[PDB]
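Form 12-C: Joint structure prediction
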Amino acid sequence: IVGGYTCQENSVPYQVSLNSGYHFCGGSLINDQWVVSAAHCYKSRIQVRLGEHNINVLEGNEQFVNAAKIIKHPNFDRKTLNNDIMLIKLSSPVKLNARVATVALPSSCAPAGTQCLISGWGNTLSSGVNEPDLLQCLDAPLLPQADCEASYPGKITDNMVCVGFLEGGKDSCQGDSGGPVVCNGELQGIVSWGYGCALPDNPGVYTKVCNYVDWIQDTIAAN
Amino acid sequence: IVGGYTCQENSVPYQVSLNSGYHFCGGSLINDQWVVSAAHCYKSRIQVRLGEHNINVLEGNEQFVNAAKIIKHPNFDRKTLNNDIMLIKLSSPVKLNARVATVALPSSCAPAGTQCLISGWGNTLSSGVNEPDLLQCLDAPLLPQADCEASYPGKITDNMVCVGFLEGGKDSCQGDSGGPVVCNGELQGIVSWGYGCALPDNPGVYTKVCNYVDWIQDTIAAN
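Section 2 - Result
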């Protein structure tokens, strides 16, 4: 997160860190056994870390669980990052409590103009890299699809949404990938891609989660 | 390397990749058993990969050897990155040949105005991150110490040198760390730090290797 602020400890209780020996992506806990992340965060072994605030210091609220099934959307296209969504079933349910809780799936697609919260331990600089220890938060609005399509001529599908500021300075960045944008209590987007980080006229683009609620539900049920 | 070009295959034969399960820094082979890298690339287990061109495809010229002793400069200061130099003794000597060869230590400190070659598999973008598969090369001059000190008021020691372009656009970046800047056949610098990557007025700064030749020699001899 570039241009954000440190989240109050465990105030984003559905945020998880996906770790392979190091944090490489974030995700959202949607029930006590399933996590939604970006299909481009796929790795064959993933340890999911919940209850995290400082990703590097054991603070005493963490639960670390291994992914048992990691399911990428069957139409995920690696080249356009269309359908960049993945589901991870944990190998055992987690203990839901104050610092570890669920986020709701969307009842409808949020309108342009909605303020959302994006969070993650991803890159905090618009040039070079600096990985933060503490979870970062960003308040940012959902942008009109016309503004999204204008920034990325020919690359935005109906499954992608832009969130951010066209003047730049504040955005998600590599490492935030797979994590949440929550607007009015529901998961509306997943951090997916953008050109650079926090650049003028290059807003971040997010998987539009209200397009996948049937798939997320079919898949949890069949699994 | 931002703004560079793909090196001809195995034309930088002293370049090595330091790997912990992934490439995280570069270095230079200075004899058949010792590698010089940046002290900030220190990890307790390192696999050194030599003969590399595509860091991701076995091409048939690689030699992969484990580090046996990893020695950081005793005055390395983690906060200012002063004395950012480290020596790695390989657990067995490598087979020196066309694609795996030594680079010479400096006979004197190169003058400002010298053209050098910097290489590495580090970040290729000035905003966001993109790691390349193929080794990248950059031709860049050594800058006057006054220009270096002017860009970074209060942070340049006598052990640091700037290389690059004050207009920005071309620079080394995270991941190139620890690798070589060679000028007229001798290792003159080690990729160390800079603000951002390829930004106007923020040239990269490098450990000045001609200040450490006695230490490098003492240390190889005592070990």
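Section 3 - Comments
The longest helix of chain A spans residues 213-222. The two ends of chain A are 33 Å apart (CA to CA).
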